[PDB]
Design a protein around this ligand. Structure first.
Ligand SMILES: Nc1ncnc2c1ncn2[C@@H]1O[C@H](COP(=O)(O)O)[C@@H](O)[C@H]1O
Ligand SMILES: Nc1ncnc2c1ncn2[C@@H]1O[C@H](COP(=O)(O)O)[C@@H](O)[C@H]1O
Ligand SMILES: Nc1ncnc2c1ncn2[C@@H]1O[C@H](COP(=O)(O)O)[C@@H](O)[C@H]1O
Ligand SMILES: Nc1ncnc2c1ncn2[C@@H]1O[C@H](COP(=O)(O)O)[C@@H](O)[C@H]1O
Ligand SMILES: O=P(O)(O)OC[C@H]1O[C@](O)(CO)[C@@H](O)[C@@H]1O
Ligand SMILES: O=P(O)(O)OC[C@H]1O[C@](O)(CO)[C@@H](O)[C@@H]1O
Ligand SMILES: O=P(O)(O)OC[C@H]1O[C@](O)(CO)[C@@H](O)[C@@H]1O
Ligand SMILES: O=P(O)(O)OC[C@H]1O[C@](O)(CO)[C@@H](O)[C@@H]1O
Ligand SMILES: *[C@@H]1CC(=O)N(CC)C1=O
Ligand SMILES: *[C@@H]1CC(=O)N(CC)C1=O
Ligand SMILES: *[C@@H]1CC(=O)N(CC)C1=O
Ligand SMILES: *[C@@H]1CC(=O)N(CC)C1=O
Ligand SMILES: [Mg+2]
Ligand SMILES: [Mg+2]
Ligand SMILES: [Mg+2]
Ligand SMILES: [Mg+2]
Lengths: 319, 319, 319, 319
């Protein structure tokens, strides 16, 4: 039997005996992602170019996520990469979930048709205080659900929750995601490393050494191949699906790293851990950082455990 | 006024006073590419997964190109990356054009949702001999038309002919490509370099030196950023659209390079030259190589002229 | 706030405090209908016509409904117009719902591109006996849910449940139904009558008289217009949405009428009553017939109450 | 070999040795019709209903036809049901063709999801005068091409030209029409008659008699079935494809009939004659009427020759 995402979410919801609030939240997200995907793939562009005489994607994207999420009646605080402040949802529309998201990531690559994606993280609100931005400032270890949709050759939604990681391909003919990979586990050790080497001159010494190992294995094994798409979601997904390592460590231009903690790193740290991989800054597990700002950045190295561990040891060694 | 690809091909055809054979050829290709794109984006996958109880993409892809091209009644010799021998078309279906193509490229990246593409090159048959594979063995300088379709965030067809390079976005809602960039010119000098550094230990000395320049500019300018998707069509298109350099030089694993001369390098060499860029092996212009085998490989460095020229000078210097 | 069908079903489910079984059932149906719609509108037909070298719609249709419904884990007995016997679902896949449906209706009109549709009725299984066909033999008054999807200019799903009738337009771009008409009420009296007059010579005398009234109003009011598409779902939907009357009374060729009781008449009788209209055979309310065979037929007159009542009075008068 | 509409138009163009102007015209139309079809089937409606916070179909429809047709550079005078005056195209955009069209017909049926369609007729401009509305006032016998697209269960384009009638199904997955019926011939005699009987009290005496024959065959043959969708394009297409007769004769409300001569009747008269059928007002062949106003109406009876002839004889008899 074929399993759609809507059924998958619904059975899981039933299993956990939820009141169905989170299920509605997940149904919404899932709707939002289909709307973004159709917009990404440029359906209807001929209208912009005057086919009948007569918004930018990342703005449209953000607006779909915000409106559809408010529509779920399941959230109370949203954080979007696109908005300077946490969005507090209106009382009449308020539920218990806090959702951090990046509506459209890798848009420095929309002119180039580069694979892009949406990243989401979902927290339960615990405090009884009138909902506020501090509700977003929870370490990633407290995620209830997290994943991303990727708009690449095809569109996939990957959703990690307490019980594993699942990939659902979008069948754009019928507007339905199809379970295709169940209980996904990253391989222990990979063959690909993924970093922007253009920063070779700002790299710290453990990264420099690690890059040399990959190219000239001190033990005379096969050198890793290199891949760097420049879309976190594209690169992380290849990592998840094929193994290897993905790095965005701190550099002089970005001394606390470049990627964002709340709505890029953490979600991906979460998918990686439930898939058996690791996600570190080099000094600490990503998921254990207690954030202090909703747009805080962090360095991140993630992927196959043996690989991330080999780099951690090099950071350790450079005491 | 909006301009579709079908109208663009047709006006150009009219302008050149063609008998309309090449126009039919280009209309077919354009159809084929839409069929591949819908298959790439996985429409109808739910059927494979048993939505109603009850082929691989690159095989499907190849079959669409062959059948649609035969359908144009405009070709006599096809070369596909997927077929060991040139396909000679049947007399009743025979026209004057020779088409070299790669039906689906970067499929080592379909499990990973990596952007993939189709690359085509079109030659006129000149000899009067019964059509044969030697009809494919023409230096790329003799191309009449060439381009690629990219299946990335969105689908684009790029078509270069004697009079410039044009990009047409696919609007999947109505099955129509829309002219979006006219007369495209690569910038003289870029900021991105694109190579698989995992081969750092097989690289020849001009490549090694060039990579160091990009990372540590001897003149203290800004270091290039690195991008490597691992799909020739994705990487070349970013190059075309944003400038920079793309390299696949020879290595010990691949001593004559890896990419294919007839249906990957040449088409891209052609798009690059009509867009004002360069495409060299390091010793000679790609388009001037007289091929001797339909699956011959060549090293290729291509992109922005100042950039390719800086590398050529380093090859020259290492006399 | 926009309301999708998935959210609508889910909130209603929550409201009724269901265990979510019926919700899964309704989610499935809703999926099935999108798959049928894409097949109806002929996506992918080029493959049948050899675009890459190398089932009938109503068979495909039936198979989608059966497989997707089994997939819901919510049903135990299915009745399809297409299957001679009730389908008993397997124990491991068994739930409490009995679903009578017509997978694709008005296919005598697929060669002609006539609007066609899917009709469904859902009963709860009450008896404790090992599920069997008698579980389908429930008067329509016991329906829990019922409606149809129409594949006409656009695709609409209409769903009637205890609390009213709702119409959801399919947005085929994102595979999502959008609530567009809430709590739909048929108008008391209409201006259109819908019957196949080609049977004028078999018509009983109350129908003959009623047809004359519509054309030559004995009171000198405006004569009704006539519409007869020949697709029950098309004609009933126009009735629902614009008012008037729809008739398929008994004739010599079909002495108990032509339409089917379990999976055409009853569902439509149910939509009509919750929308404020009537559905009679001429002697009794359709919804009160206790069926004795799963493929039993019945005469049906349905639509706006004043209109159906005017015809009932004529049947009464012809004592 | 599969045949797309674009190839079909192009080969025919080649065969007739056209300069390719009409080919561009037909390519445009074909594009326009795909844009209308996607709009009809309501892709993107969720945007109207606020999926991201934040025109009517027949207006949109009209605008697509006008802009795409101007885009062909092939026309000089357009007549649309929607515009009070002929549209004269601008000199820089001017070609030789006159196109009469009805952008979206049967919209009195968009609330009801009734099958609707677009009807077009194409004339060559013969006079040398500065193009004007009299260029539209040509009897239908002078058509060069004519047909309609139908938005019904699926979308079909039917195109009649001097050499026969051809039907092309739209495959919405790839935005391509597929030849499915070649050289279509209506059957000599049919079994269906199609008229709005609600006008029984205004009908002239030959229509009244003809209707009685269909229901009570004076020769004791089988009575015709009745079908009346209320969309000219739906009813005419069923007629073409299944045979029978379609009538919209004059009534007191509409003493010169209701349908329009330039952009409904004539095109359909033309398709019918090239398919072997007839199209009469009852006194004269539709195609031979010399129109005097661009929005002139005419009575029309059309379909299978034996059938139209049986009605003509009854009009003759009622001397
Ligand atoms: N659809 C679902 N899938 C997986 N887990 C869920 C789902 N719904 C609820 N849960 C678990 O049950 C908790 C409470 O559910 P709720 O009543 O929906 O807020 C959630 O925070 C999850 O831990
Ligand atoms: N559609 C077209 N676009 C651009 N150039 C064309 C086109 N059709 C023909 N040409 C030029 O005219 C030559 C002969 O055309 P043909 O008669 O189509 O083989 C082609 O090889 C091209 O050089
Ligand atoms: N999604 C729903 N929409 C409307 N009514 C429902 C829904 N789910 C359940 N109900 C009502 O609750 C009953 C039991 O629900 P269930 O536990 O899903 O079988 C159903 O038979 C309906 O009467
Ligand atoms: N694509 C076509 N299909 C069928 N007939 C055509 C086509 N193109 C041209 N013709 C015939 O050739 C005439 C002149 O063509 P043109 O030069 O396109 O205006 C047209 O009016 C038609 O009679
Ligand atoms: O150009 P850089 O510095 O290598 O940045 C690449 C990163 O930038 C982003 O687009 C911005 O978030 C990421 O998706 C991607 O990983
Ligand atoms: O793994 P490598 O050796 O870097 O190869 C990448 C290249 O391989 C291909 O997929 C094979 O043609 C190209 O599209 C791409 O440029
Ligand atoms: O040709 P008839 O006898 O008027 O039948 C029309 C009816 O037939 C069906 O196609 C068969 O169920 C109905 O949808 C429609 O109402
Ligand atoms: O309601 P009536 O008078 O039967 O009109 C039906 C006709 O009206 C139109 O919608 C108006 O052109 C036609 O397509 C159709 O044949
Ligand atoms: C496209 C445009 C751009 O600037 N890049 C990032 C290097 C792209 O991929
Ligand atoms: C996906 C799968 C694979 O092996 N790679 C190439 C390194 C992918 O991108
Ligand atoms: C199409 C084909 C057919 O026989 N009819 C029913 C009268 C159609 O509508
Ligand atoms: C829909 C709405 C309307 O008034 N009718 C025409 C009788 C429809 O079909
Ligand atoms: Mg981001
Ligand atoms: Mg290749
Ligand atoms: Mg039926
Ligand atoms: Mg009209």
């Amino acid at each position: 039997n074929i399993v759609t995402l809507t059924r998958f979410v619904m059975e899981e919801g039933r299993k956990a005996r939820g009141t169905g609030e989170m299920t509605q939240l997940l149904n919404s997200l899932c709707t939002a992602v289909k709307a973004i995907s159709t917009a990404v793939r440029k359906a209807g562009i001929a209208h912009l170019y005057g086919i009948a005489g007569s918004k930018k994607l990342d703005v449209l994207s953000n607006d779909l996520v915000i409106n559809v999420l408010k529509s779920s009646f399941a959230t109370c605080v949203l954080v979007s990469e696109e908005d300077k402040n946490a969005i507090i949802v209106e009382p009449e529309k308020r539920g218990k979930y806090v959702v951090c998201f990046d509506p459209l990531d890798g848009s420095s690559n929309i002119d180039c048709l580069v694979s892009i994606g949406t990243i989401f993280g979902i927290y339960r609100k615990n405090s009884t205080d009138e909902p506020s931005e501090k509700d977003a400032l929870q370490p990633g270890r407290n995620l209830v659900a997290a994943g991303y949709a990727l708009y690449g050759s095809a569109t996939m939604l990957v959703l990690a929750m307490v019980n594993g990681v699942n990939c659902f391909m979008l069948d754009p003919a019928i507007g339905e995601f199809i379970l295709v990979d169940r209980d996904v586990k990253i391989k222990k050790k990979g063959s690909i490393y993924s970093i922007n080497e253009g920063y070779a001159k700002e790299f710290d010494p453990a990264i420099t050494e690690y890059i040399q190992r990959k190219k000239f294995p001190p033990d005379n094994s096969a050198p890793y191949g290199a891949r760097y798409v420049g879309s976190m979601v594209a690169d992380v997904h290849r990592t998840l699906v094929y193994g290897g390592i993905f790095m965005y460590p701190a550099n002089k231009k970005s001394p606390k790293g470049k990627l964002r903690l709340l709505y890029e790193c953490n979600p991906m740290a979460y998918v990686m851990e439930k898939a058996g991989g690791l996600a570190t800054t080099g000094k600490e597990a990503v998921l254990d950082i207690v954030p202090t700002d909703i747009h805080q950045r962090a360095p991140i190295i993630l992927g196959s455990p043996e690989d991330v561990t080999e780099l951690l040891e090099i950071y350790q060694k450079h005491a």
